[PDB]
Amino acid sequence: EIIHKLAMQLRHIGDNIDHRMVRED
Amino acid sequence: SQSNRELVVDFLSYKLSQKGYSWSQFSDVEENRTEAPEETESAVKQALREAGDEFELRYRRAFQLHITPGTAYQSFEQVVNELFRDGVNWGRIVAFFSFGGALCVESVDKEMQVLVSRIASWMATYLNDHLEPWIQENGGWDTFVDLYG
């Protein structure tokens, strides 16, 4: 379970610092 | 065209240096450290270094793997696969760099420093094979600099 847990924590913080790109639609 | 090798080497060099280690101790691949600050590649490198610092700070505020030389490749690839399975964005790419940097630092601490050059290889291969189409379709590393630099 540790691989999934770690990947989802990395992904959560990744999405938190992201959502910066402007959607043109 | 932007070298993904160059970004991996720069980022891992930075993370190792923050813990007192030198990339050149673990690989004979060199980074271009003389390019002008005004160059786009220097701007990409700086944006990625700072984004990694900010990612690691935010990760530490909110949040076992037991890396071994026999399991490191599968553990790296499986985490990265799950990270990107439902999509790519620049923040997840920063997470990918910070994850690799963390594995490298830990590998030197635990007397497994042969892994430093191998993690770097796996990162560059993943970038060149699996992230590069998205990078190219989303405005390239220049867009990353606009958003994070």
From Swiss-Prot, chain A:
The organism of origin for this protein: Homo sapiens
Cellular compartment(s): Peroxisome
Gene that this sequence comes from: PXT1
Protein's UniProt name: Peroxisomal testis-specific protein 1
Interval of the full protein contained in this chain: 77 to 101 of 134
From Swiss-Prot, chain B:
Tissue: Widely expressed, with highest levels in the brain, thymus, bone marrow, and kidney. Bcl-X(L) and Bcl-X(delta-TM) expression is enhanced in B- and T-lymphocytes that have been activated.
Membrane topology reported for the UniProt record: Single-pass membrane protein
A Gene Ontology cellular-component term: mitochondrial inner membrane
The record's account of how the chain is modified after translation: Proteolytically cleaved by caspases during apoptosis. The cleaved protein, lacking the BH4 motif, has pro-apoptotic activity.
One MF term in the entry's GO annotations: identical protein binding
Motif (BH3): 44-58
GO BP terms: apoptotic process; apoptotic process in bone marrow cell; cellular response to alkaloid; cellular response to amino acid stimulus; cellular response to gamma radiation; defense response to virus; dendritic cell apoptotic process; dendritic cell proliferation
Keyword Phosphoprotein: yes
Keywords: Apoptosis, Cytoplasm, Cytoplasmic vesicle, Cytoskeleton, Membrane, Mitochondrion, Mitochondrion inner membrane, Mitochondrion outer membrane, Nucleus, Phosphoprotein, Synapse, Transmembrane, Transmembrane helix, Ubl conjugation
Span of the annotated motif BH1: 82-101
Intervals of motif BH2: 133-148
Motif BH4 in this chain: 3-23
Function: Potent inhibitor of cell death. Inhibits activation of caspases. Appears to regulate cell death by blocking the voltage-dependent anion channel (VDAC) by binding to it and preventing the release of the caspase activator, CYC1, from the mitochondrial membrane. Also acts as a regulator of G2 checkpoint and progression to cytokinesis during mitosis.
Swiss-Prot/TrEMBL domain comment: The BH4 motif is required for anti-apoptotic activity. The BH1 and BH2 motifs are required for both heterodimerization with other Bcl-2 family members and for repression of cell death. The loop between motifs BH4 and BH3 is required for the interaction with NLRP1.
Annotated protein name in UniProt: Bcl-2-like protein 1
Organism: Mus musculus (Mouse)
Residues of the full protein shown: 2 to 196 of 233
